[PDB]
Amino acid sequence: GSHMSITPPQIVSALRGRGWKASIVKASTMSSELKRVDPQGILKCVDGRGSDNTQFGGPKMPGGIYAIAHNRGVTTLEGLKDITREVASKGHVPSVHGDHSSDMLGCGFFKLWLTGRFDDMGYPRPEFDADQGALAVRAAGGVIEMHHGSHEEKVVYINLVSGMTLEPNEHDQRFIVDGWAASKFGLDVVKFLVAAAATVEMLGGPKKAKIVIP
Numbered sequence: 001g002s003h004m005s006i007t008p009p010q011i012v013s014a015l016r017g018r019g020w021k022a023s024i025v026k027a028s029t030m031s032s033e034l035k036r037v038d039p040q041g042i043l044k045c046v047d048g049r050g051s052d053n054t055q056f057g058g059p060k061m062p063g064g065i066y067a068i069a070h071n072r073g074v075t076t077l078e079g080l081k082d083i084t085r086e087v088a089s090k091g092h093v094p095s096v097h098g099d100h101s102s103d104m105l106g107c108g109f110f111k112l113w114l115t116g117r118f119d120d121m122g123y124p125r126p127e128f129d130a131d132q133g134a135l136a137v138r139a140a141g142g143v144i145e146m147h148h149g150s151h152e153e154k155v156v157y158i159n160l161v162s163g164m165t166l167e168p169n170e171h172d173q174r175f176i177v178d179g180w181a182a183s184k185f186g187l188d189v190v191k192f193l194v195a196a197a198a199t200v201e202m203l204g205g206p207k208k209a210k211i212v213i214p
């Protein structure tokens, strides 16, 4: 698809400029945690909470496949179904998620998007609600995952190691953003990463990041 027009040191610079604490960490220091992506795993949200997921090992993007629609300015249910099928055809099981406290509005990213919190960054709002979106993804062969508990993330990992990912730990949470996946889907990587950063910020998450590189 597209390529990383931005380097790791710059990502760190951009984040710090947004008021973040950021540093670069080598993949070799996480040999124990970095997992090769499993094609049977759902491409899911960066959310650090536990859930009822049984399809582990998939890439992590804000709102699951919503990160792709959001980055591309795709705002219709038909377009979302197209993306769902596209993701399935590209090696991952597509998904979106809700939670127990707010049901389908349980994904903070989609709620931020639907409510216009990305208005100032110039993003077109979706033209469907969280219930409509979830059911469209399901009807197109995707998965609706359900999270539980409170957001207790302590750090954000921005993984740039292609084909690998990190998994949720509900008792020692972290946001995980597979930046390499944005390139795989031809997304504007810089916008994707800035949106992921804004998401953590607006969800009142920790503005501390570790950028993982080969």
Ligand SMILES: [Cl-]
Binding pocket: 045, 047, 106, 107, 108, 109
């Ligand atoms: Cl979420």
Ligand SMILES: [Zn+2]
Binding pocket: 045, 046, 047, 062, 063, 064, 097, 106, 107, 108, 109, 110
């Ligand atoms: Zn979410």
